[PDB]
């Protein structure tokens, strides 16, 4: 069902997505242990993800939430990093596969800081780093994140001790 | 898990590090659409 459409670097859509990536990098309290040491990325490719079935079920759910929340879906664009990106884009997100308890329980996690999502691309705490070099700060291997449309609805506010 | 009753998601908002932005959690897959796939390298600082 899924096709991937390459965006050209001159496309305004490429540029606005890249700008969100680059500008939401921060320093992390682990000094780069999980995700590596960097202030910015080299963006190699941006692809639009097109899947009619996944989109229709997104918009169907969005309408339900919105009607539960004074006609406010509370839709954001957020980063997601994990090792399951290739399954997600073909099969969609699936809460049944998301059974790992984290800081906020089991569930599907997103971040405003792209650098936060970057810490998880090779796994929890960055796992053992890239498959080729076992380096969590590898400057050579190619990484992937998703920039996702997410319906929050009424969101429970959890202040965290981080 | 499940959203807390009467809510559709959780917002995890850092309260110590004032420069860290939020994380969010959802509990249904249909509440997100993976719209862009970004392929990149991290860059070594100069
Ligand atoms: C092994 O690497 C990781 C990395 C990050 C995570 C955490 C984030 N994980 C998720 O957001 C998450 C999202 C989607 C999925 N999977 C899918 O939606 C999915 C759909 N179809 C498949 C095959 O998977 C799984 C997880 Cl564990 C879980 C809590 O701990 C911190 C973040 C869990 C495991
Ligand atoms: Zn590597």
Summary tags:
heterodimer; A: alpha+beta; Phosphoenolpyruvate Carboxykinase, domain 3; two-stranded antiparallel ribbon; B: mainly beta; YefM-like fold; 3 strands; 0% helix; 46% strand; binds ligand 1TC; binds zinc ion; Poly [ADP-ribose] polymerase tankyrase-2 (chain A)
List the helices and strands and how they pair.
The complex is a heterodimer of chains A (162) and B (46).
Chain A lengths: L2 E4 L5 H12 L17 E10 L1 H16 L7 E6 L4 H7 L16 E4 L2 H5 L24 E9 L3 E6 L2
Antiparallel strand pairs in A: 1-2, 3-5
Chain B lengths: L8 E6 L8 E4 L5 E11 L4
Antiparallel strand pairs in B: 1-2
The complex binds the ligand COc1ccc(C2(CNC(=O)c3ccc(NC(=O)c4cnc(C)o4)cc3Cl)CCOCC2)cc1 and zinc ion.
Zinc ion binds next to loops of chain A.
PDB class: transferase
Keywords: protein-ligand complex, diphtheria toxin like fold, transferase-transferase inhibitor complex
Assembly: dimeric
User: What's the helix count of chain B?
Assistant: 0
What is the H/E string of chain B? EEE
CATH fold annotation of chain A: Phosphoenolpyruvate Carboxykinase, domain 3
How big is the Rg of chain A? 17 Å
Structural class by helix and strand composition of chain B: mainly beta
Task: Describe what you observe in this structure.
Chain A: Zn(2+) binds at residues 130, 133, 138, 141. Chain A: It is found in: Cytoplasm; Golgi apparatus membrane; Nucleus; Chromosome, Telomere. Chain A: It comes from Homo sapiens. Chain A is α+β, with helices and mostly antiparallel strands and 162 residues long. Chain A has helices at residues 12-23, 52-67, 85-91, 114-118; strands at residues 3-6, 41-50, 75-80, 108-111, 143-151, 155-160. Chain A has a two-stranded antiparallel ribbon. In chain A, strands 3-5 form a two-stranded antiparallel sheet. Chain B has 46 residues and is mainly β. Chain B has strands spanning 9-14, 23-26, 32-42. Chain B has a two-stranded antiparallel ribbon. In chain B, a hairpin with an 8-residue loop joins strand 1 (9-14) and strand 2 (23-26). The radius of gyration of chain B is 16 Å and the shape is flat. At the A-B interface, strand 2, helix 2, strand 3, helix 3 and strand 4 of A face strand 1, strand 2 and strand 3 of B. Strand 4 (108-111) of chain A pairs antiparallel with strand 2 of chain B, so a sheet runs across the interface. The complex binds the ligand COc1ccc(C2(CNC(=O)c3ccc(NC(=O)c4cnc(C)o4)cc3Cl)CCOCC2)cc1 and zinc ion (ZN).
